[PDB]
Amino acid sequence: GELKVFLCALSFVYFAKALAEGYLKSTITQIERRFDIPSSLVGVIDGSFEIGNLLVITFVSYFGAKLHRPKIIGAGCVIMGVGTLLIAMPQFFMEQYKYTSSSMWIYVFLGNLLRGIGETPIQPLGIAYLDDFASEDNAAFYIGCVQTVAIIGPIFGALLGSLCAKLYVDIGFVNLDHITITPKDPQWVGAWWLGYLIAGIISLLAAVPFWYLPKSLPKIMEMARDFLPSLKNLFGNPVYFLYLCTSTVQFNSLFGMVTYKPKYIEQQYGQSSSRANFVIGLINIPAVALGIFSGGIVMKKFRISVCGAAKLYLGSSVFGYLLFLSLFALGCENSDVAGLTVSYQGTKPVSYHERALFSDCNSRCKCSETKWEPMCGENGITYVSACLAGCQTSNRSGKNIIFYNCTCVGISSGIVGRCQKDNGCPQMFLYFLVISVITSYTLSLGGIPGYILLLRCIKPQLKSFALGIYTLAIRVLAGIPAPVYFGVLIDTSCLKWGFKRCGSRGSCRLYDSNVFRHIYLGLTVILGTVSILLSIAVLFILKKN
Numbered sequence: 001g002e003l004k005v006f007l008c009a010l011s012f013v014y015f016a017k018a019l020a021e022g023y024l025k026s027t028i029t030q031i032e033r034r035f036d037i038p039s040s041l042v043g044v045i046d047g048s049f050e051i052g053n054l055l056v057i058t059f060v061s062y063f064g065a066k067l068h069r070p071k072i073i074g075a076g077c078v079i080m081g082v083g084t085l086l087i088a089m090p091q092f093f094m095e096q097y098k099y100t101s102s103s104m105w106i107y108v109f110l111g112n113l114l115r116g117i118g119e120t121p122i123q124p125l126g127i128a129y130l131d132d133f134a135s136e137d138n139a140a141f142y143i144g145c146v147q148t149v150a151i152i153g154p155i156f157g158a159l160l161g162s163l164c165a166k167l168y169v170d171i172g173f174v175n176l177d178h179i180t181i182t183p184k185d186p187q188w189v190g191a192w193w194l195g196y197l198i199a200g201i202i203s204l205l206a207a208v209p210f211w212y213l214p215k216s217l218p219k220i221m222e223m224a225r226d227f228l229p230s231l232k233n234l235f236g237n238p239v240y241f242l243y244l245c246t247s248t249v250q251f252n253s254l255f256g257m258v259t260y261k262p263k264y265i266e267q268q269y270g271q272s273s274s275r276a277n278f279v280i281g282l283i284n285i286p287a288v289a290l291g292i293f294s295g296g297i298v299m300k301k302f303r304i305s306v307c308g309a310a311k312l313y314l315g316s317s318v319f320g321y322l323l324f325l326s327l328f329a330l331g332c333e334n335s336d337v338a339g340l341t342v343s344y345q346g347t348k349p350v351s352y353h354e355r356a357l358f359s360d361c362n363s364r365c366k367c368s369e370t371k372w373e374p375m376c377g378e379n380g381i382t383y384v385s386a387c388l389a390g391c392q393t394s395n396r397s398g399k400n401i402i403f404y405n406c407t408c409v410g411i412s413s414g415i416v417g418r419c420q421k422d423n424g425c426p427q428m429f430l431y432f433l434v435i436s437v438i439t440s441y442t443l444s445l446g447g448i449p450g451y452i453l454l455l456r457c458i459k460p461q462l463k464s465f466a467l468g469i470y471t472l473a474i475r476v477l478a479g480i481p482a483p484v485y486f487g488v489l490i491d492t493s494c495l496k497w498g499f500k501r502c503g504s505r506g507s508c509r510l511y512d513s514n515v516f517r518h519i520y521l522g523l524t525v526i527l528g529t530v531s532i533l534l535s536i537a538v539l540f541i542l543k544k545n
């Protein structure tokens, strides 16, 4: 009974942590779309959690294995909740919002730092406690349930972020009857702070059950001395080392795939950002959670050994990246954009040295080069801005704006937005959706077999330390670097760069579909192939030993 209570408490803690991270990400994403924060500052906010987690993950993982693990998890939850509550602090000190970096971001930085610090004991100590006292058949199932809760959590965080953004910022502080603005108003400001308070309260509540859980189920100097031999023992173990390398390469592939999958959908298939986020959050993430749970259930039900676990991991990786290779055939060509993909004469592929945002048809109009306000003409050719199309008059009809007397279009009306991709791209998008869902499920099928691989070949006293080292390696070598170079190589395929209000380079507005697809899919597939080779090596060594 105590083991089930611990499992429920750990699942609730995972849910709270995932909800907090999801709310942070979703809130920052919307804030980036309405407000203007320089990318360096949001990068600092992201990196504070990182340094806080990395500085203490190894210390906690090594020195908390022999201590009261449930109580250390409870303390970590309390620290996480306190840090999350500290993020919403500035709202209580800033003046009432009336309708950019000084002495007020310290609260956010400290809150993210403490939230990263409190995060460290949850996974290594919790999973080690779960594995030590559960039977070998049920340990995989319990780990699968915990990871399934972890994957699903951020969906609720995003939902809470949306609900909070639908509320006014000064709710509770200012009489709302005097507010005449609606969420559709460009000056509307959401109650960003409310979700942080809710997440902090949930994290604090999650620490209560661990004060009543026992240390085990049916001094510092010595640990410091044994630390160095233990690290060599873990890295002297070839199964653990090679699985660590395999997971590092595979997560280098996976983080890069996940980070730029929204943008790939929007750019390759012409979908809006909302649709791209929807198909990922409510379709791909459930598939990932189902794959993890299915892997755990398969491990439990058929009593799969370590060799079978390695075989399942290898098969899941192989059949996931094989299906990911199928996405190469599901590609639409670049949309007709005048001056970047085609000339103003409607001539197909134009080269680099001919990027002619100014033409004869729009010489009479003094247009801005930096502004990206795309309009779709009656001739099916998208123009960078209405000025560049030679449009002289604009008429607002209903929710739409129609431009007339567009000189470039006549070589003459146009609507707001990009022209839709006509020749079978929605069908290609549907096939992409199906294959991507199946690929996500297949890749997630091996998440728990690899986790069991990590645990069943080390000496039982070093499970927490091995989990800590694994988490540190995944964060440092896969979590941090993979987005950076994926983005850089992807940015090499940009055709038109937007700018922020301060003149700094913003997100790219137009990519080259072919080059973008090639880079994005090829990097993922190559890293996956390297991971498959390493998994084959792991399986060979397991068979040898």
Ligand SMILES: C[C@]12CC[C@H]3c4ccc(OS(=O)(=O)O)cc4CC[C@@H]3[C@@H]1CCC2=O
Residues within 6 Å of the ligand: 027, 028, 031, 087, 090, 100, 101, 102, 104, 105, 108, 192
């Ligand atoms: C990062 C943030 C979005 C908006 C932020 C902000 C924006 C302008 C601002 O104006 S400032 O002149 O006081 O610097 C202060 C702040 C304080 C932190 C605040 C939020 C904390 C959580 C969050 O999602």
Ligand SMILES: C[C@]12CC[C@H]3c4ccc(OS(=O)(=O)O)cc4CC[C@@H]3[C@@H]1CCC2=O
Residues within 6 Å of the ligand: 030, 031, 034, 035, 094, 097, 165, 169, 188, 189, 190, 191, 192
């Ligand atoms: C009031 C404010 C200016 C911009 C504000 C803003 C603007 C859009 C926004 O996006 S929204 O989706 O929540 O509507 C959120 C916020 C959150 C508060 C934020 C600042 C805090 C201090 C400040 O000077």
Ligand SMILES: C[C@]12CC[C@H]3c4ccc(OS(=O)(=O)O)cc4CC[C@@H]3[C@@H]1CCC2=O
Residues within 6 Å of the ligand: 254, 257, 258, 259, 261, 280, 281, 284, 285, 288, 292, 439, 440, 441, 443, 444, 447
């Ligand atoms: C379960 C997992 C976390 C993230 C997972 C994921 C997340 C989004 C995704 O697709 S996505 O479009 O939603 O970005 C695919 C996948 C494939 C499996 C992948 C990992 C394997 C091991 C792991 O810890």
